Design a protein around this ligand. Structure first.
Ligand SMILES: Nc1ncnc2c1c(COc1cccc(Cl)c1)nn2C1CCOCC1
Length: 289
């Protein structure tokens, strides 16, 4: 089907927060793009806005067209590549310390960027980080803002109030410990989750992973119990102390606190330089023959 006048809808690729993604072609421009279709019978437009607000940031997919099409709502964005999870599998589930640091530098910046635009992601995990293709193939992109919400006012930089008794709201494997306590989620939570993702890449899997549970409720309860019984020092044993520093710093932040993104990045950059690596964007998978 021909959509938005210049786009050609192709076969389905996968799916987003609440909608199905297709590989399409910007016929006039000759570029592959990704197209999400949302029944006029709702999240596309809520995202389009959060997406056109993030416009311009590195690692933020571009929105090329937004419109109605007969019985569908249409959004077109640049076609991105494999998620970090797909690539991790592709590398026999092993990432060198250099790949982990290269990703960490970019990932921390992405989260900083979003927070500067008054939003907190709330669902930071490996599948929501994809590399770019072609000219953007060396860049880590972040997706799925279905759970993203404003945490502070544009003008009075007034921070959302503090509140507890809230149900879990993302993946429980990478959720921050306070998310598990019903505490409202803020900037510190996005960074803590990124933190688990990093150790997740170094270990191959987290200690609260693959637990044994008869019911769904008991599995979530076990994950939370385990993530609270595992000290950061035990989680990070055998790996550069910097990963532990990052995690303790995150967990320590105060609800409305502003993270020191620079310190966190430098934490890793100093280690990176001590190891003698260069920020050459040469990841493990780039070495696959
Ligand atoms: N841009 C993309 N390029 C390549 N792959 C992509 C995406 C998106 C988001 O695409 C849109 C398009 C229009 C609107 C919105 Cl919200 C999201 N998701 N995926 C994958 C689909 C399969 O499942 C895992 C993720």
């Amino acid at each position: 089907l021909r959509v938005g006048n210049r786009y050609r809808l192709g076969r389905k690729i996968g799916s987003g927060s609440f909608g199905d993604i297709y590989l399409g072609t910007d016929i006039a421009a000759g570029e592959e793009v990704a197209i999400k279709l949302e029944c006029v019978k709702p999240q596309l437009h809520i995202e389009s806005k959060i997406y056109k607000m993030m416009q311009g940031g590195v690692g933020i997919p571009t929105i090329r067209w937004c419109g109605a099409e007969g019985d569908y709502n249409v959004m077109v964005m640049e076609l991105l590549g494999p998620s970090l999870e797909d690539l991790f599998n592709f590398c026999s589930r092993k990432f060198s310390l250099k790949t982990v640091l290269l990703l960490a530098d970019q990932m921390i910046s992405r989260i900083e960027y979003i927070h500067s635009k008054n939003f907190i992601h709330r669902d930071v995990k490996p599948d929501n980080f994809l590399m770019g293709l072609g000219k953007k193939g060396n860049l880590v992109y972040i997706i799925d803002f279905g759970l993203a919400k404003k945490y502070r006012d544009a003008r009075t930089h007034q921070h959302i109030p503090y509140r507890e008794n809230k149900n879990l709201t993302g993946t429980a494997r990478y959720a921050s410990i306070n998310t598990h306590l019903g505490i409202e989620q803020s900037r510190r939570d996005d960074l803590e989750s990124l933190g688990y993702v990093l150790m997740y890449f170094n270990l191959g899997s987290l200690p609260w992973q693959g637990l044994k549970a008869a019911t769904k409720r008991q599995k979530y309860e076990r994950i939370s119990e385990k993530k609270m019984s595992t000290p950061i020092e035990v989680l990070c044993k055998g790996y550069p102390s910097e990963f532990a520093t990052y995690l303790n710093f995150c967990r320590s932040l105060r609800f409305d606190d502003k993270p020191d993104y620079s310190y966190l990045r430098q934490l890793f950059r100093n280690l990176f330089h001590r190891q003698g690596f260069s920020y050459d964007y040469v990841f493990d998978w780039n070495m696959l023959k």
